[PDB]
Symmetry: C4
Subunit: 459 residues, 4 copies
């Protein structure tokens, strides 16, 4: 009778929860735990995204306002990673003095709720640091000399800091000049909800950088905002988000227990069948449960990081987002296993998974041509094409070219002053596009004439 019982076991282990009900009126409480998971995880992700949008928008808007306030002649768009640049000694002096003077008159210039903030030394003021190579008989060591400009120093009607010997810069040895100050703001765009607003501290540094010593000073504006508590303020949910994140951890933990239970019990059924087969003489793994386990672990980790961020009021959510997003993605891929319970969501799998070896072998072959073209393009067209500046950019450009993106712009971007490089670029681009189109279309006719045989043999 043990053979019949074993056969009934697997006959029950291989059917969908919808059917298992038909066979035994059983309730898949585990499938329910999964629907409640998809709803709770998606809800948490959306709420987290909305709150992050609000905070990030406030910080970025304040940064743009600061750039307009303190950078002289700021266009409104960052030239590069740096905001603006100067090419003349008098331009650099004007930018430095403009930043200092705008800080002096902040209360009459700012449109928002800004005030001066105490520095790390507990004093309202401005710090300017400059670095020079010590001394063309320059040395290799750098000299760092700074002074602290208090509000009393700036407020003197005859300004003495402008005429001081500090601000003679000797630009041929100058490495950089750095201006640091702190500002305190408030977002009143939160009081219309009877919730006390969040006071912010801004640590702004302006760096006038000429490490390159190429005749251009690059001006970087960096604003680091952190959420302090409000001290001087009188007008007229923390546990809620935390309980929700704790429930999410409970559901994704319960799912983690159940899936690991099923995998362990699946290994037990293998023994019985394997031992039974021995006497007379990955399918059991169900690698969707691997995906579910990974997504549960990632959701638990991301929820813990989110709780930690909310608890201590921290504003960088990059790694918390990378866990929650990559776990929600896997949750929706797990919806496909449930969808992949009706027989109709199959039959094309006999090609979608069977072609995978052929495609992966093709990728290995085409990968070597792709690497060779990447190296060639970087070395040759690097100094003449902005899409070939570095190896990673070359790889992205070649990937996009394989997909038809910006071909004419790619051809036209390279100037014709160097005739040899122009001819080589033409040959390079034409050969790459033609060769890869040919290879992709070939791979493909083959994949077809193979499936044809595969499906013929299957029937």
């Amino acid at each position: 009778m043990k053979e019949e019982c074993l056969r009934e076991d697997l006959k029950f282990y291989f059917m969908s929860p919808c059917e298992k009900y038909r066979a035994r009126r059983q309730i898949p409480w585990k499938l329910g735990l999964q629907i409640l998971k998809i709803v709770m995880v998606t809800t948490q992700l959306v709420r987290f995204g909305l709150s992050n949008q609000l905070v990030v928008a406030f910080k970025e808007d304040n940064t743009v306002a600061f750039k307009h306030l303190f950078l002289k002649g700021y266009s409104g768009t960052d030239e590069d990673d740096y905001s603006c640049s100067v090419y003349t000694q008098e331009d650099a002096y004007e930018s430095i003095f403009f930043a200092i003077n705008q800080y002096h008159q902040l209360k009459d210039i700012t449109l928002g709720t800004l005030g001066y903030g105490e520095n790390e030394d507990n004093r309202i003021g401005l710090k300017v640091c400059k670095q020079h190579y010590k001394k063309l008989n320059i040395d290799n060591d750098v000299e760092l000399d700074c002074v602290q400009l208090d509000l009393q120093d700036l407020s003197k009607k005859p300004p003495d800091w402008k005429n001081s010997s500090f601000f003679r810069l000797e630009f041929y040895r100058l490495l950089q000049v750095e201006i640091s100050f702190h500002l305190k703001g408030i977002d009143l765009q939160t009081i219309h909800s009877r919730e006390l607003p969040d006071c912010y501290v801004f640590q702004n540094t302006i760096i006038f950088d000429n490490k390159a010593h190429s005749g251009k000073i690059k001006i970087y504006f960096d604003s680091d905002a952190k959420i302090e508590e409000c001290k001087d303020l009188n007008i007229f949910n923390a546990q809620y988000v935390l309980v929700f994140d704790a429930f999410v951890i409970v559901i994704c933990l319960a799912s983690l227990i159940l899936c690991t239970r099923s995998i362990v019990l699946a290994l037990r059924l293998r023994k019985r069948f394997l031992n039974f087969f021995l006497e007379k003489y990955w399918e059991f793994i169900n690698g969707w449960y691997v995906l579910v386990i990974i997504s549960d672990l990632m959701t638990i980790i991301g929820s813990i990081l989110k709780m930690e961020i909310k608890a201590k009021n921290l504003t960088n959510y990059d790694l918390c987002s990378i866990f929650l997003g990559t776990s929600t993605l896997l949750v929706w891929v797990g919806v496909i296993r449930y969808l992949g319970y009706f027989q109709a969501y199959n039959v094309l799998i006999l090609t979608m998974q069977a072609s995978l070896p052929k495609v992966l072998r093709f990728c290995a072959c085409a990968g070597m041509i792709y690497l060779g073209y990447t190296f060639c393009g970087w070395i040759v067209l690097g100094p003449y094409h902005d899409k070939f500046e570095n190896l990673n950019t070359v790889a992205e450009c070649l990937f996009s070219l394989v997909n038809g993106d910006d071909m004419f712009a790619t051809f036209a971007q390279i100037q014709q002053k160097s005739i040899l490089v122009w001819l080589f670029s033409r040959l390079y681009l034409y050969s790459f596009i033609s060769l890869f189109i040919y290879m992709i279309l070939s791979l493909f006719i083959a994949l077809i004439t193979d499936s044809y045989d595969t499906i013929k043999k299957f029937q």
Copy 2:
């Protein structure tokens, strides 16, 4: 003999109007009613579009002129949903005073036929409203205080409104300042047709908005134009368009009667055949007639809305256009049924409609991956990529990426200051593009090796 008669019925019910003439010299007056419909509906749509183009062009040109007249330092292009922005208290004051002074001197500045218009209170003048949080000890309530600047007030050679206590703004509590005025224009670009021109009333509001309190005031210019009747004017078709719209309603109503008649009579023939089949023991629906009925209803509704708009001289035609366009689209799809009467416009239908279940099943599976990628991309790359700002934008970006659009720009838009987010973005984009290309090409080889069998079985 009833069997023969029934057989002759269906033998007549299944043939084209061109053939039914061969079988009985009958005139398909109903097919004629359809050609006259396609011509009348298309003609009405084109005439409506041309007239709307004229009116909208006049209104938009006047709005651009107003923005140049009243917005200080207007570039010519709206920065965003708002036209321009300021970052300094003195800039905001300059913009406000510039708007007021330009309104004061309108007659000497405008190039067109503009004049002052009476307000809702029947008085030529300018209204300025400002909103402040009541009182950092601010309250949660807002205070709205306004004054009306008449032309006599502005025309005083010593201006007293500039120095009044109204225009001290206390920007840290300011929510917005709003300027409202009315102008009356004429389009003389209609007199060259001996048709009396249309006098317009413009309700212009300039909103200096800093609800965000982020250090930037956004300046919105909104112009609401309505067509009044001309009062002061002496120089040297309404029924026509209305009769045409009424004829359109008659033709699309007659077609509605005939199609509903045929469907009802089609149900009668089903009874006869079904009862006949019972004794010895959607095709009849002709779902093209469903399309014709829907298009007729939409055309009647759109024509009624068009008549209502023309009757009371109203200038917003968004919903009238959405009915007429979506009905003309369905009319041209109904041309395909007539085209689909020759046998040659078939045979490919045996795949165009048979593949539909497989494609729809594929869309269900790929839809879950698409949703997962949408959520992941929004949560991770949202704060760093302008094409991932919100969920709808992420969905559009992913759809476009599946079609090869702006891949290199999408890769390059994300800055590399955050290395973790940069690496994740690279992995995300590469995986999405590769996976979806693989899935689409797979779906496809399958659809082929299936049709092959389907067409083989058919023959």
Copy 3:
């Protein structure tokens, strides 16, 4: 013996010139006439293109210089079909007076070889014309009043034209103000070849246009350049190009005779075979010769027009180019018949021409959906999308969308202030792209499963 002779005829009429030599050592002097044609026609086209490039470049460079000289605050790029625009009465006055003053001081401002040219009335000077509606009690008639500003009038140290009653404009009735003057230039960039340079006459008109009466004056600069003969000039091939064009006409005329001879003689062989077939009881046309005849006619016409243009020194070559280009295109298509003489350049024709009926039938069906979408998109998204402004633009946008071009930009271009139009635009774009991708891929699986059968039956 007549049967054998007839059979030998066709056996000779159906072989390639290369083979006919193998069968009879015959020289295809006619195939030679064709190679000399491809070389002579291509050479003529290239020479014509180079000379046109030179002339057009000179004229366009002079036009750009004129725009910088006479248009106040010209950016360097035309805003639209018009060069620049103004929105204030004082701006319009400044532009008009700037143009007049720059003309007054031309000799000291121009960098090239420019001088004043006599007008149609044989007098060096400037003409200003203005148009007003006669007289709000305006009439429907226009009044045209002008004055001629001579160089003596402009050179008076107290300028009287500025203060004259002519230049009070009454902008509310103004239609346009037009400034006309003539300049004479020389291209010294032709003397370095010992060829006397070409003196030009420029007829420049500046139109300050406000027909719209929308508060914007559009400023058009139109320069009409014609090649006069040089009068005042002393420094230190016309028959050649003409003889070459005459030889081209001879070769394309000889080819026209021979092809028409062969077609006529081909009809003779049809009679013999057709009569022979009758006794016991397009292939002969060779529609490549139709292409050759059309290309010969077009080349002769284009060469005649080119000779006419060169003879009387005229500078508009639009229709001459459209004949020469479209004839050279057909000449290269005729190279394919010669290439299509080896057997290997066939066998794929059994699908390239057999699929044509199925594709054309598909285009008829998809054409109706394309027209419906064009009308719907124009009527709905016309006032909100710059790619849907008019019907032709909508058709081009839909064609490009079918090919994957600017999808994200097309989605993003439409603003979200109108929620109904935004939702409809999303539905419209998604449905169009999905439907047309589906239809194209379907047409295609069908074309395959058909060729498969076609090629199977062929063997």
Copy 4:
């Protein structure tokens, strides 16, 4: 026994190095020489690219700084191949005088480490050369007259060079004005590595060019930088790169010997088999070795050029890069032969190489249509479309259009003032896109229905 020995020979000559070990425990020291080659060649290329990036970045940054210092009103972006342009005599004078005055005050304007450099005549100063047509009674000869402006000449408090008769230019005869000067810089961005920095000499020429005589002067800034040795400098690997390049030459020379040895020995085995076949009565070439030999030759040549460049301190690496890149590309293609030793990386070759004749025949046919369209588009749309300016640009535009790139932009770029050219452009673009899409999809259905038969016959 010689038959058995011969059979054993080939049985050994046709197996992979991995297997030959299974058959004889032999060590493929030659395959090792290949892995060490791929690592050494890639390493050399990467190091060369990084060093070139540094040098080129320094030179380009200095050039941008020079353009900002010496070009009046420089925007920051080159208008074209030329940096900026002027259209007025006074603008040209201002630009010339601005360049001279900025050179005079260089020490107080430059941000980097710049100084005056001696000219070719060993004297610090500025040279201005102007060219005029000799003398409208101009001649054909040019007159070149120049003066040398020393620092003493520029430093005189009353400037005499401004008022000299040299700088009256007579613009109607002017060909160009050229300003030449030398500057000496240092990159201190190399001292932070205890490596003495590289002093540079810059040969800057500013050319005010109006060869066109079209009313625009084009201003070219050309900076030629060469690495001199440092003379005045006191602060606080050449053999390494050279030994590495010499080792690379040894490995790519040893590989060249071995591959040529194998090819020669391969020809010996052909004799034995061919003679053996005679008695009773490219595969042997292994054209991968041709690729290896070519890549070895290119690597040796590129390494020699790199050694020559490093030895004499020269900064143009265009041809050295074109050899190293195109050799590294071939090295990665040679990785595919090793990958193509497992049987699985085959079977698709039976189509990837068999389709090549059909595709090449298709390219020959489609090439003639492509050439015809190129000529037609250039001749017609050349003067109206910036993507059709010259034949090469037309070819690139058509290639991109075949791949779906910028279709709507291509359609929209051509203005509608000329209706005939607009209609022809529409017809041209539509016909090209439709025809080439049709031909590519046809080629393709054929390639499939052929492989099907090919693979069927193979089995």
